[PDB]
Design a protein around this nucleic acid. Structure first.
Ligand SMILES: [Cl-]
Ligand SMILES: [Cl-]
Ligand SMILES: [Cl-]
Ligand SMILES: [Cl-]
Ligand SMILES: [Mg+2]
Lengths: 83, 97, 100, 121, 99, 92, 111, 100
DNA sequence: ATCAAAACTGTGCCGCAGTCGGCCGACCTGAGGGTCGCCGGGGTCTGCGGGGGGACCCTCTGGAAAGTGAAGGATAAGTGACGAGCGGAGACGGGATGGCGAACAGACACAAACACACAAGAGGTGAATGTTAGGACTGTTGCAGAT
DNA sequence: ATCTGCAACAGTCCTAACATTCACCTCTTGTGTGTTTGTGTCTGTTCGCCATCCCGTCTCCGCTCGTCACTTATCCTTCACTTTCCAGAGGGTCCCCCCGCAGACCCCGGCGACCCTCAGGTCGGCCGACTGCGGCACAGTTTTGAT
């Protein structure tokens, strides 16, 4: 409904799940919102960098490598796509 | 036509896989992972080796530089053994033919 | 009968066990893909992705949040609590240097 | 007769990894003006070795948990279970590897008896 | 005439004092004997240039001060003002130094 | 007597104890710590030892690799830099 | 041989464009190193140098001093959000910390 | 002393000084402070050259040009710093490929 | 201390692929061979600065005493998540075009590499010449703790 | 609520230390000028796969509810940690002795670059294709939850 979601698409349940893989037992109410923010800043930094790689390359498509390189210099190195 | 062919370490990984587990097969994503791992390790070591070379104002990355790198980049016994394998392989190569 | 409702926490405790043994992403893909496209909009308008990149991005972000939750957990527990609040998603971010 | 050819440096090394590709990559990665002879043999050796260590533990992965194919998840159990690899890859995230089964012993109840333990760890 | 500040008035006085200054806070000779001892027990024929011990002390003191900051946070997070081992341990842990 | 006795290498032990209670207390003050637990001093001693050991190990490694027997500030500087604790003020 | 014009004058920079070219060559970041490359980088370094210097200069002046010391670099840098992130993993020898006491540790203004 | 020829060591000292004079004519800098300025320049140089170098690899290019320095600067310096920096760099490239 | 309602577990059988071992094909690349600049291992002379130590000043440490106020245990009160039943929404699997755009690919200007005389920008020295923080030594002011 | 007394701030001479300005002397080294590989630009073609309406199956998100257990605000008791006093251990500073060895040189063999063919090691398809392995269902232990 005009993007009544998106940055709000990541739901209270998904969060509770990630938090359980995390080992969290009891979760307070305002967490879901705090989390939603955090995930946002993380993506803002990763994607900002990815796209910067994309533009330098003169393309209009973001590739796995652009994302992988980004995560790399963000010190969050990933294995499984960047080869 | 045909893709410019992507070089990988997949053949060598698979090979090794065997010498340690012929009774085991390796996934598709899991093999890229290993491919990633090797490239990483490769650049970290080459990188440190590059720096070692520049710090002592040398223009060559020798076996010495790779060794020193390994001592700096790998944790305890992991480094102990890697150094072991390293020197071993280099001499068996230098002498043996 | 009654909804046989278990003891508050036993389900959770079990959810942990299942999700810790799992390996599949927990954010529902489509909604997540939207978020990504939204963010990117603010850096380079009109640009296409590559299904994997989104997977890479989703793969990376989930690994990040779970890890952070681990820390936040330790932090709540440190405060003698058992419920993760925001005051401790923050102490974790602060000490990690993600908020300085 | 352009003389009997053969012998890959990898063989004169008894190494399962590509000594010549490696010497190639070193020379073309702007790492240094010149790359020595030993260098690639040494690097390939270290690389083969680490690969081996993971795989090794990665194999016993589908054995202590049944299965005969190495998927990401095994690699992860392997690495995070071994202190040393875990450090070497403490800032790396293996896709589709999940986490390790851990549950703070203060969240789980048992307030009755069982085997009241607190004098070990 | 017997005078006495209340517990925590000198402490705050000091926090104020040490945060205003830049001087090293561990004494020089003792610090150097420790560096020489730790090294010797790795390699035996070493000598240190003085500036190397100085770098080592600058890096060390900066590292502890920053760690005490995070520690202090941990303590405060636990509704306390007294730092403790459990606080340094949570700091180091979350930092990825321990686990 | 007069001229040249000889002098023996000093034997070093227990030097972590030179990191006194008051010095540790002063570091904690620069960090803005108001109250310090009694068990904090041996902890700090432990953390610093570990910290020094990691740096020193790496620096000595840069020293050896260069075939020297004397550790320089640069060796310390590169060791610090490779541990992500870059230091300014001593070359580099 | 028409006199001699430093690539720096040609670019209106103070930092040594020629030297930056050379360092880029010998540091082996690549086979060839473009003509603007050293020019652009030498500009950036100069910009970042002036920002640090401008703030450190102001700091020295606020503490009635005329000679910038390390403490002034620390104050400049740690009081600026952006420079602080850029030097987040850096230690400035002899710079101290930013005076800062957690509120909860202040004398309870009630007794 | 005796004839040995103290090896020559170079630094950005004199340039750092010019810039200082420009912004604060009547202000000096201690030697440790200058030693620190020299370190900062070097650090940043490697930080950029290095990201640049990498860029060219990812793009099979074997040349480091202004377009790599700029992307580099953009990935490296935080916020407004990059803008000013990209602005000041470009500005000189131009003044340079043009004038003489 | 012993019974009930759920919720994981491997077996069990079976379609949907997912890795395999070739089957060759097509190359691209690492090796065998041989010429060739110039880097790095050697041997030398050698000043500088590290380890030890004395001598003297005086600051900072260590230890015991007394007192408080911070930590933590015990308990009570207000409610914030959790467990759940449950109805649909939109997330997800299964497909089919429609085309932007990424990956090559051949062709060739120029851009950057070298090669080299050649000046002067830059660095290392001593040195007047100062300006400047750093150490007492004293007053002014703010304020914490005592009546 | 006034009062005393100690701590932090400023000023002020004062002299050693650190800087800045000479100006001079080597000399690496950046620039001026001209050839010379080959890399990046630019144009041109293929199809990979990304964007996307389309359409059943329903898993999974939302919400209202019941109520328990977790969190937090209090009130108390115990003692841990801050302040102080003060002797004197030992750090700081200066100055020295004895050498170890960092680093500037110089001389020149190898070593690794750079060429040039060439055989084959490595990659991309297809092709069964052997088994590999989640995708539903069963009955069996394994528990939490109450009597
Ligand atoms: Cl070698
Ligand atoms: Cl909170
Ligand atoms: Cl503790
Ligand atoms: Cl350029
Ligand atoms: Mg010893």
């Amino acid at each position: 409904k005009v993007l009544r979601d998106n940055i709000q698409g990541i739901t209270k349940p998904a969060i509770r799940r990630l938090a359980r893989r995390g080992g969290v037992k009891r979760i307070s109410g305002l967490i879901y919102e705090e989390t939603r923010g955090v995930l946002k800043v993380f993506l803002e930094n990763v994607i900002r960098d990815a796209v910067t790689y994309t533009e330098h390359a003169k393309r209009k498509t973001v590739t796995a490598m652009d994302v992988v390189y980004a995560l790399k210099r963000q010190g969050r190195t990933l294995y499984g796509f960047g080869g | 036509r045909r893709k410019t062919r992507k070089e990988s370490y997949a053949i060598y990984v698979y090979k090794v896989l065997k010498q340690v587990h012929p009774d085991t097969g390796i996934s598709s994503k899991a093999m890229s992972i290993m491919n990633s791992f090797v490239n990483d390790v490769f650049e970290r070591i080459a990188g440190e080796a590059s720096r070692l070379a520049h710090y002592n104002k040398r223009s060559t990355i020798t076996s010495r530089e790779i060794q020193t790198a390994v001592r700096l980049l790998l944790p305890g016994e992991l480094a102990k053994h890697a150094v072991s394998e390293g020197t071993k392989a280099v001499t068996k190569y230098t002498s043996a033919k | 009968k009654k909804p046989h409702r278990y003891r508050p926490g036993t389900v959770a405790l079990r959810e942990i066990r299942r999700y810790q043994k799992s390996t599949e992403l927990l954010i529902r893909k489509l909604p997540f893909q939207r978020l990504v496209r939204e963010i990117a909009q603010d850096f380079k308008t009109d640009l296409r992705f590559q299904s994997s990149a989104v997977m890479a991005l989703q793969e990376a972000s989930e690994a990040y949040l779970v890890a952070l939750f681990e820390d936040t957990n330790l932090a709540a527990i440190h405060a003698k609590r058992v419920t993760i609040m925001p005051k401790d998603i923050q102490l974790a971010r602060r000490i990690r240097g993600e908020r300085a | 007769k352009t003389r009997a050819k053969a012998k890959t440096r990898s063989s004169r090394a008894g190494l399962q990894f590509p000594v010549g590709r490696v010497h190639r990559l070193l020379r073309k990665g702007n790492y240094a003006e010149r790359v020595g002879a030993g260098a690639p043999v040494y690097l390939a050796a270290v690389l083969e070795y680490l690969t081996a260590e993971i795989l090794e533990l990665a194999g016993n992965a589908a054995r202590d948990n049944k299965k005969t194919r190495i998927i990401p998840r095994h690699l992860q159990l392997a690495v995070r279970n071994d202190e040393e690899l875990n450090k070497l890859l403490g800032r790396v995230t293996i896709a589709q590897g999940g986490v390790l089964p851990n549950i703070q012993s203060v969240l789980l109840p048992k307030k009755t008896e069982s085997s009241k333990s607190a004098k070990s760890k």
